[PDB]
């Protein structure tokens, strides 16, 4: 597991990691994925280990496809480390820009309510829901209805990156 110096330096520059951290992430990545390429089955295996009695199929697939920047069916180290940099160390605006790419499942530039429900449902499918009274059930649908309506300031049925990035931010 030896990364070429020019690659280490470029991936350093492109991320929030120090050169040492990039090499440490590579050593662990190659330890777990000796070919240097993580596939979708191995990506879902990670989530099933977290939540062995949820169903992570949907969430893992949605996130995998976003992480797989060149859509070759594999997460390579360059993809791995740039994805980890933004999702773990980004600013709030950068983390939400990443999340917008995830939620915008058909890549038409907007988040529609069905798309927000697909992600939220994927999440609850994997990790579960908070047990509640049958009259106050924590259904993704009613949660999405609330949040989606709050963020759709112009009520056109669709969310821009700007509408989304302002969702938890206070004024």
């Amino acid at each position: 597991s030896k990364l070429k110096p020019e690659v280490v330096e470029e991936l350093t520059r492109k991320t929030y990691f120090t050169e040492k951290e990039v090499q440490q992430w590579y050593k662990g990545f190659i330890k777990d994925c000796p070919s240097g390429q993580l596939d979708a089955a191995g990506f879902q295996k990670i989530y099933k280990q977290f939540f062995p009695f949820g169903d992570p199929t949907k969430f893992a697939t949605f996130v995998f496809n976003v992480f797989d920047e060149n859509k070759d069916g594999r997460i390579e180290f360059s993809e791995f480390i740039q994805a980890l940099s933004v999702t773990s160390r980004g600013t709030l605006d950068e983390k939400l820009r990443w999340a917008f790419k995830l939620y915008d499942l058909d890549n038409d530039g907007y988040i529609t309510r069905n798309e927000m429900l697909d992600i939220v449902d994927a999440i609850y499918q994997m990790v579960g829901n908070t047990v509640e009274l049958p009259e106050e059930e924590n259904t993704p649908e009613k949660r999405v209805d609330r949040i989606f309506a709050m963020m759709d300031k112009n009520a056109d049925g669709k969310l821009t990156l700007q509408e989304f990035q302002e969702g938890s931010k206070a004024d």
Partner: peptide
């Protein structure tokens, strides 16, 4: 006690954290 961040489910932050944690598990 609810998981701290799942209040952020639907806002983007929950997905981001879960994504990050999967990558961290993939490299440890």
């Amino acid at each position: 006690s609810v998981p701290r961040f799942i209040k952020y489910t639907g806002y983007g932050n929950a997905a981001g954290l879960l994504a990050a944690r999967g990558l961290m598990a993939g490299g440890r």
